[PDB]
Amino acid sequence: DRIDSVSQLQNVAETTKVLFDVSKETVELESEAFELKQKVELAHEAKAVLDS
């Protein structure tokens, strides 16, 4: 049973840090979508002025 308690950790060290990075850097990539939302909202505002 001690071996079994060690059994789960076998194929987990493979990607624990890989997940730590995948869920970190890709989430860090959200500033681009933020700034693009900013420009899209500016486009919506000006386009609405034009539509008015």
């Binding site: 001690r2 308690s5 060690v6 840090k17 869920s23 970190k24």
Partner: protein, 85 residues
């Protein structure tokens, strides 16, 4: 909040403190154990030991192992009565 290492905290504590104590007792118990029944030391013979390792040995442990004492004491006591009576 943000990214961390939920799994990598196995550094601060190994899994199973009670299983760790049990396994540590297991390591000392199994390691400090004879390979296969090692260290027997059965035979012995020196005046009385030739009777101890033979007559007090558990190969038989029957009734005659005690009865040898009765036969011998009877041999002694018959001569005791002969010298006494």
């Amino acid at each position: 909040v943000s990214t961390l290492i939920p799994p990598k905290v196995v550094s601060s504590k190994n899994i199973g403190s009670a299983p760790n104590a049990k396994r540590i007792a297991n390591v000392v118990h199994f390691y400090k154990s004879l390979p296969q029944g090692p260290a027997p030391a059965i035979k012995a013979n020196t005046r009385l030991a030739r009777y101890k390792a033979k007559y007090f040995d558990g190969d038989n442990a029957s009734g005659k192992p005690l009865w040898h004492f009765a036969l011998g004491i009877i041999a002694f006591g018959y001569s005791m009565e002969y010298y006494f009576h």
